[PDB]
Design a protein around this ligand. Sequence first.
Ligand SMILES: Cc1cc2nc3c(=O)[nH]c(=O)nc-3n(C[C@H](O)[C@H](O)[C@H](O)COP(=O)(O)O)c2cc1C
Ligand SMILES: Cc1cc2nc3c(=O)[nH]c(=O)nc-3n(C[C@H](O)[C@H](O)[C@H](O)COP(=O)(O)O)c2cc1C
Ligand SMILES: [Fe+3]
Ligand SMILES: [Fe+3]
Ligand SMILES: [Fe+3]
Ligand SMILES: [Fe+3]
Ligand SMILES: [O]
Ligand SMILES: [O]
Lengths: 400, 400
Amino acid sequence: SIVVKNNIHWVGQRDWEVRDFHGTEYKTLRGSSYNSYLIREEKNVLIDTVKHKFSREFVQNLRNEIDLADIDYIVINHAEEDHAGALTELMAQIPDTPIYCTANAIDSINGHHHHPEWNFNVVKTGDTLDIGNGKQLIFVETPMLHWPDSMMTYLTGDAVLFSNDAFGQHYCDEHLFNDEVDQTELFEQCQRYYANILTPFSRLVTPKITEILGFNLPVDMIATSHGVVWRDNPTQIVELYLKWAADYQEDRITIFYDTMSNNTRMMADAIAQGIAETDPRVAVKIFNVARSDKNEILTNVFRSKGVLVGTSTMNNVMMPKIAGLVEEMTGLRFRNKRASAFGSHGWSGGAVDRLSTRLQDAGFEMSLSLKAKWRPDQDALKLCREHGREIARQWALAPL
Amino acid sequence: SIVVKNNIHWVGQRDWEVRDFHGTEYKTLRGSSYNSYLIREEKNVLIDTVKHKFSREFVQNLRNEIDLADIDYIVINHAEEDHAGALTELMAQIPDTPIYCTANAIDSINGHHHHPEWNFNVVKTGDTLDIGNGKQLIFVETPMLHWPDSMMTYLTGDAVLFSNDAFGQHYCDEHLFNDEVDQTELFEQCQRYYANILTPFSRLVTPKITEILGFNLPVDMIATSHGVVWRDNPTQIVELYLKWAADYQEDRITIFYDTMSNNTRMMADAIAQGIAETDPRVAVKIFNVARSDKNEILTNVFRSKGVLVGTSTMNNVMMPKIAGLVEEMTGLRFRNKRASAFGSHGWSGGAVDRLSTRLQDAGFEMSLSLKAKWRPDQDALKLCREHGREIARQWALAPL
Ligand SMILES: Cc1cc2nc3c(=O)[nH]c(=O)nc-3n(C[C@H](O)[C@H](O)[C@H](O)COP(=O)(O)O)c2cc1C
Ligand SMILES: Cc1cc2nc3c(=O)[nH]c(=O)nc-3n(C[C@H](O)[C@H](O)[C@H](O)COP(=O)(O)O)c2cc1C
Ligand SMILES: [Fe+3]
Ligand SMILES: [Fe+3]
Ligand SMILES: [Fe+3]
Ligand SMILES: [Fe+3]
Ligand SMILES: [O]
Ligand SMILES: [O]
């Protein structure tokens, strides 16, 4: 275990090997960590657990820290398996220990563990739990950030906000604190997490943070459930969340596509050229979805003012990876972004219009599509290059 | 080169390494081959070429066989890049050589190569080309089998049908003939090809084969553009195509899904149990789409009387790989098949109904969906098992 601050002990688990979260929907290229915390004042409090995979290690390590019977309260901020996964193993040893959680957390904890006989204590925003020595926990409900059961726990005096998933990132390191790790790697993982997970709830992020800030509670540290503890200028991640939540976009355009014989790829490259030679301010990224990291594409889409999506026509429909990615984007609800569909066809086509419509359903403000037959010759590539020019002009953040 | 029969020489290319066709839409787990044929009678005829990747090898090997100038006619059955890919390199050496192809082939050849100055000779079904020694080529248009440009070429006397893609398979072997290779491996690759490529055109397969058979032309060999030459009971693959085209289905049910935390997986296994303990005649296959070969899933769907597709709810929509696979199936147009959607959810759900509707759009006759909240307990697993029982009864090919 590691001392976070005073009597706050980190008793979590580092995961250097993990590469997949939520099936394979989230790729963790730098592993992850599952942060659990043990607070030892007059009362002993355990905050969250770890992934079920490491329940054996977690309980044993916890034993080496404290007799399990001396644990007074258990706090569950969020009942997703990577945080509440070792709960069944733990409660088997100390079944009478009270669990403090939201009303929705009873549903989700029971939904995974099927032990409704556990002693649940429903908490609501403003509710407190005294732990002695002039210190208390303050609970803050954060529903749909990102689950119905989600909440945060604040420790007075030490001024530590246990924010669970919020402000966290999948970044495994032997060092605990934000000032002890690589800043570029930390930021990349932070933005990757928000873009792929929190984007659809951005309208909820601002008001909740505003509400939390309105409590006028001091914040020395933010101890999340993933990655580093924020101790040096800890509210920097809070400020990033405020920027990211405000329908964030940079002067950037992301192009991605799938292709069966590279014709649509040729179109994508030509479009990009047209953009770059029209507006030098725009950052351009191109991805073949069949050969790229899906989460990296989505992080870029998050950072972009607009996107161009390409597909050829395959059996009168679009290529499946594009349909899949478009489905997922429809769930992420990107806001204030523009889009244009493009791609090649052999005879009757139809996939480009099909894609243009689904992008619109996904919430993008649609510009005209770009189409070509078979492999683009020099004349066709000119038209693609001109399309990029028209897009760059239409989507310009400022004149010229 | 290899002697196919008499003066027919195989001058193609084996591809032991290839693993992806049409982007990554078709996985070639046993590599492939690109069959090109040189007929040397009074006239010298080249039938098809090979993938562009091997154009250098192809032209050189062809040189070792014959002076390129002594080639009288070039036949292009199909202008997809894996057969017409080396055409530009070849025609650079012998630009005056006539190319015999369908009207649609002019569009597709020019569409890829951009050399419309080439000497094209449009052919239609019944058209002939004398090559001397009492032998002639007979052309047969096969539009949308599987491209608009597709055709077959028949050689009289030797009685060889050059069928291009049709009756072919992606199966690389040093041996040329069907009786010289592993029969189980050959069949598997043959069925994989039809299921993933030809399924949507099945209504066209029967009439065209009936038309071709009506010509009363003898068939000693079927020389396709992929894999083996059929010489021993060659029409066996023709008969298989007739069976496969007739909305083929076995007493088989395929279950596939994606899952973020395995709840839908638990549902799938329980459903399968219910089926197996209700109808022992049914063959059951289960696939996690995130961890499985997509083409294997589709081959099974092709062989199945019905399917069950599972998804959890992810940001109010379905998981992307399921949406992608469903999109692709909508293009393949499976016929006379039944389907049922299932999966888990956390709160409001909606993905299971969303999937049920899209399966219906894909052409499946829909049975009721199966839903569960979070992880299924023993009672929930019973309901899943009962769902399998109800499906088995509904989809029974015969009583009991
Ligand atoms: C398996 C397959 C299915 C196709 N289906 C259609 C179709 O339904 N309609 C059409 O116009 N072209 C169809 N085509 C032709 C392609 O769309 C055409 O080759 C296109 O230029 C390829 O674009 P890409 O190289 O970017 O994948 C199909 C091609 C293949 C290989
Ligand atoms: C990223 C994510 C998004 C989710 N979105 C929804 C949702 O929109 N509606 C809902 O009812 N449940 C939602 N859930 C809850 C899951 O559907 C629930 O955990 C389900 O039981 C998981 O099924 P599975 O393990 O087969 O993937 C979401 C879960 C995750 C991890
Ligand atoms: Fe979570
Ligand atoms: Fe988490
Ligand atoms: Fe083809
Ligand atoms: Fe082919
Ligand atoms: O999580
Ligand atoms: O092909």
